[PDB]
Amino acid sequence: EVRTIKVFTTVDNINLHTQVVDMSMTYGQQFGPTYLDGADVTKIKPHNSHEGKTFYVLPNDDTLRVEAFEYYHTTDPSFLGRYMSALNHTKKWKYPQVNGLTSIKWADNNSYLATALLTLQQIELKFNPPALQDAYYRARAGEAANFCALILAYCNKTVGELGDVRETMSYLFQHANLDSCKRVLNVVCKTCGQQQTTLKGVEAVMYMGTLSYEQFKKGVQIPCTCGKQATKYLVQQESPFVMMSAPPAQYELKHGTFTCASEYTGNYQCGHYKHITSKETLYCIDGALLTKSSEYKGPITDVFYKENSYTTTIK
Amino acid sequence: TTVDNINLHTQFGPTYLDGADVTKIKPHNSHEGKLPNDDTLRVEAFEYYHTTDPSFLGRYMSALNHTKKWKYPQVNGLTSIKWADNNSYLATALLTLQQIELKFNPPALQDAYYRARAGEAANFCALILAYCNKTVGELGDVRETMSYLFQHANLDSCKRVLNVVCKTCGQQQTTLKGVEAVMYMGTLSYEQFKKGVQIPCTCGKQATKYLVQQESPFVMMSAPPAQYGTFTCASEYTGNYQCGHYKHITSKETLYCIDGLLTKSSEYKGPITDVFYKENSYTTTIK
Ligand SMILES: CC(=O)Nc1cccc(CNC(=O)C2CCN([C@H](C)c3cccc4ccccc34)CC2)c1
Ligand SMILES: CC(=O)Nc1cccc(CNC(=O)C2CCN([C@H](C)c3cccc4ccccc34)CC2)c1
Ligand SMILES: [Zn+2]
Ligand SMILES: [Zn+2]
């Protein structure tokens, strides 16, 4: 007749919701889309081994919608489904510790995430969504599948898709605490005069255009609207890091003068990322592969630098 | 007092007057009678903007101080922006939004989009800039801006199923939702995506991916610039990755090109970066 078991559904693995299930129905019928440790179990009927387990459902009642928002800080209805679908893959990657950092053995065209994950472990960053804070702790410890799947979901990228690092840090920074970050710039044009500007949030820690923090501090040449080239330079920065990005170009990472950088060999549709880190010397981390050198020149796209408080001396 | 111009609180901390940062200015006599640091302002601000960035309002105000000085003529029935401050990407975005079926979630974007369609896009422009985390005058990209705004749009009814056939692995159907359901990066042609484009598979071979099923009111196809009544609209980019200019192409009674200026033609070939197509329900025929 009626054969049934007890489960918990959840969206955050924090609030669990007891349900009973008629074994005579596949999970979807009773819950909608249903997952077991990443596996889409919507179309399976309950096993005796399921008694007492926990299942992610979708926020299909008002209570779950609010819990999901408090945990993930997103209101895209498809977020949890897209996250779970990614997790079915990221749980299958291997995440070896290479030079003290969690990287990822190459799989499923994930080179940009490996380099993002290594970068994330070297910069001062506290996340706001509890899901990312929790998954990031796990990632730093070496169990990074959930972290990788959440980055994919927040970035609207699917498993196997070609990725760009600059876009990922910007997406993640929208979800990071940059409250104390401050950037002050002056732009001096021989025609137009001087203009100071203050920037906040992601733009206060990100600049696209030069890899050299020294050149940014000294002044970089950009076009002015009057037609002249003006020079823009950094007057004041209060932040724990900066990220500099540019189209891939041959570049000289010198030991000890930056934190880490990303190297891109390829073209705009297909290319490969490697991570370069400055430790006692220069290490090139490529998934599980590791190399060392005293100097480096290669096709660099992003350079990260340490910071606390900077004020220019150029008046 | 206010953070949203809807919920008012009788009364400072950070203070703004019609876009100009006046926190550090003292009131003038002409000012008589006219940041979210308490719970009333925190709740009102979140319900209106759908962001919890503490710095959001400062960047929105800074942008509005500039965008209120732009001019916004109606060209071929759409609000554009007369050129100022390297706003060609913002101009092309505003012309594009008014031409496809899309519903916003933050009350701020619906309200600003409605005002913009009527001709008052200053508030709308400061909101686009804040959501895309750009300051006024910055060089912008259509694909990136659209990715951020679609992140803030109701694309809930959109669904996409694709199949990938690899000579080693077999066939795999994959389902996408939200932004990935309406955007494809790799080809400008919806027809080729429906018929199939060759892209890499995880085993290292190049595989062929084609569209099995699409349910949505529009699609956006983008690719790096190349020479290129069959589409709704597209963006044309002249330049290189660091410096260039956007124009807009709309397919109506003929093909019209709006560049902040407007011309027409019966045929069109140029350096296209993004192309837009109409949809309701499409299903492929390889069965
Ligand atoms: C719109 C569209 O069609 N996107 C698309 C299509 C197919 C595959 C991919 C996935 N690959 C990417 O997204 C890349 C994007 C960025 N770059 C670096 C940072 C890079 C930066 C600047 C200039 C570059 C100029 C040349 C090469 C790289 C440049 C890394 C990879 C994306
Ligand atoms: C904080 C700050 O200042 N950020 C900043 C700085 C500089 C520039 C920009 C924005 N950059 C852009 O908008 C262009 C860049 C990319 N694409 C083009 C279509 C494009 C697409 C694909 C391959 C390409 C391959 C080669 C060339 C172009 C390619 C769109 C426009 C932002
Ligand atoms: Zn000038
Ligand atoms: Zn394969």
From Swiss-Prot, chain A:
LRR repeat coordinates: 117-139
Effect of residue 66 to A: Partial loss of ISG15 cleavage in vitro
Subcellular location(s) of the protein: Host endoplasmic reticulum membrane
Domain Peptidase C16: from-to ranges: 71-315
Binding sites annotated in the UniProt record for Zn(2+) 6: 189, 192, 224, 226
Active site residues of this protein: 111 (for pl-pro activity), 272 (for pl-pro activity), 286 (for pl-pro activity)
Topology in membrane: Multi-pass membrane protein
Coiled coil: none
Catalytic reaction list: Thiol-dependent hydrolysis of ester, thioester, amide, peptide and isopeptide bonds formed by the C-terminal Gly of ubiquitin (a 76-residue protein attached to proteins as an intracellular targeting signal)
Regulation: Inhibited in vitro by GRL-0617.
Resulting phenotype, residue 75 to A: Partial loss of ubiquitin cleavage in vitro; no effect on ISG15 cleavage in vitro
The protein's assembly and partners: May form homohexamers. Interacts with N protein.
Task of the protein: Responsible for the cleavages located at the N-terminus of the replicase polyprotein. Participates together with nsp4 in the assembly of virally-induced cytoplasmic double-membrane vesicles necessary for viral replication. Antagonizes innate immune induction of type I interferon by blocking the phosphorylation, dimerization and subsequent nuclear translocation of host IRF3. Also prevents host NF-kappa-B signaling. In addition, PL-PRO possesses a deubiquitinating/deISGylating activity and processes both 'Lys-48'- and 'Lys-63'-linked polyubiquitin chains from cellular substrates.
Protein name according to UniProt: Papain-like protease nsp3
Region of the whole protein represented: 1564 to 1878 of 7096
